[model samples]
Target: GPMLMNSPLRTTVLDLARTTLGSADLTAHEPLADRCEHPALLDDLATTLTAVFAVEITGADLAAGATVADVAARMDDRRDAPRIPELRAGLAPRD
Candidate 1:
């Protein structure tokens, strides 16, 4: 997580999760348990996430079959999180 500078919270979270699981194809919609081989790594991910985001991340926050995007959003909700709403919203599918 050294080069986390200027990276969005979502990207950083995804990166951290991928590094923790040693998987590059991990997606926001993928279930945590599905991608994780070691259950203890999730705890390590939580700890690293808390340190990186400066937010308290506990099992309670990751409950309810949480996914990557869900956890990223939860971190955003907790504090003065950084985001590119306009860019993200603009790229999002509109109907």
Candidate 2:
């Protein structure tokens, strides 16, 4: 899980969340709904992941083109099933 190129989703998600939010104490399983702080940032993070998973299915080249617009246009929900699982940990957002 330390190869840098690849690791488990929990490992990757927590690292990005901690580094992005600057909190070493945040747990991997911590709901991003608690960590997002503001609603706008929460939307940004969702859009970001849409593109990330879109690229996983479409390719790295499409990664640059990843967007909420591109998501509905290019990503297929049924075809891109695996990525949805990765998003489960952060699905709930505190209102």
Candidate 3:
């Protein structure tokens, strides 16, 4: 069955990291539908972290230091995830 518009698809950056481990494949190709439904907080974090990690893990650095399993273990560590309330607090008040 085709995935429904609101249907949930469980995936994680760990999955992505696994796909790229040791082979230097750091590119991500999220499906259009999946990208469209991403929570704003998740999307923002993904975009920001992509740039951050790109610099950290590119060119001979390899994805060897941090395995997807390690990251997945820390997925809920708060240090790896976004803090939306803190971000919102810094925004200007809306009319």
Candidate 4:
């Protein structure tokens, strides 16, 4: 299984999707994790990013001929979400 933040894989997947749609204007934004300062946090970030990308790709495929719809659908999916729980747990907040 390919982990998220696999930069090479991310680039390849983005490129493939863009090419398949005959567009040269696709951009894949990597996610940022402000609390990812430890090894465990990094791992969780990778897993979370992977899940995000998985959902994005699914929406993209579902949108087929509408690029804007694809992007909007993916964005909408994240509009009200909290940090992934697994990642949050790994970072146990300090009191």
Candidate 5:
């Protein structure tokens, strides 16, 4: 099951959104644009998030209508998934 509430990633995402976007009224379930200062600010937030989490998060990942919870879930998924397949790869035929 996907963990959303009380998750560290979610908390971090919320905090980052509030700080980077300068909007404390934003909710996890609500779209970010609902309270964002401007569209460009999302790019800044993504940059900050990527730097903090060491994961890639571009504008496409934070497209319009995306919520804080959604961002957190995506980050959580990306973090949990193995980037280096060799470490967790199964005995499948190599391409």
Candidate 6:
């Protein structure tokens, strides 16, 4: 919830992931798109960051067929990755 409560810059990536991924939960509407700029940057960061962190990723992810759950799960599988609940609490929609 901190991302939503804090800077919308980070929230853009999460929020975009939810919408394009077919989410139906409550999420932040007040986008700081002006500050966040390109959504793909966030996605790329996550993908690349995991590689640096040693999270296994397949080519399918970088492919257009990739799912939101796919990217989120990749990080979720990491050893030092944040707890799913914590991630969902912040990334997933909440009322």
Highest lDDT, which number?
5
Candidate 1 deviation (Cα RMSD): 8.5
Candidate 6 off by > 4 Å: 1-13, 16-60, 79-95
> Taking the tens digit of each residue's C-alpha lDDT, what string does model 6 give over 3-85?
22343233333555445333445143422222234544545544554544345344334334433333444443342234356
Model 5: per-residue lDDT, tens digit, 6-95?
566778777777777767676677666657768678788878877776665787767566677777777666656654566532223334
Error in Å for residue 55 of model 4:
13
Query: Model-by-model lDDT, in order?
Result: 0.63, 0.40, 0.33, 0.38, 0.68, 0.40
- Identify the runs in model 1 with alpha carbons over 4 angstroms from their true place: 1-7, 60-64, 80-95
Worst 10 residues of 5 by lDDT: 86-95
Candidate 1 lDDT over residue span 1-95, tens digit each? 22223436777777777887556787867777667777667777777876787664665456346676677666555433333565543224333
Tens-digit lDDT track for model 3 on 1-95?
21222211113453443233322343233332223233333334344345433323231222224333333233333322343556622223342
List of clashing residue pairs for candidate 2 = none
Model 5 collision count: 0
Q: How does each model score on TM-score? A: 0.65, 0.37, 0.27, 0.27, 0.70, 0.27
Question: How does model 6 fare in lDDT?
Answer: 0.40
| Model 4 spans > 4 angstroms off | 1-3, 29-61, 64-95
Which number leads on TM-score? 5
The positional error of residue 28 in candidate 6, measured at the CA in angstroms, is 15
lDDT by residue for model 4 (1-95), tens: 11332343344445544444344565553221221233233333333434555433332233333233333344333432443656632224343
lDDT of 3 at 17: 38
Distance (Å) between predicted and true CA of 54, model 1?
A: 1.4
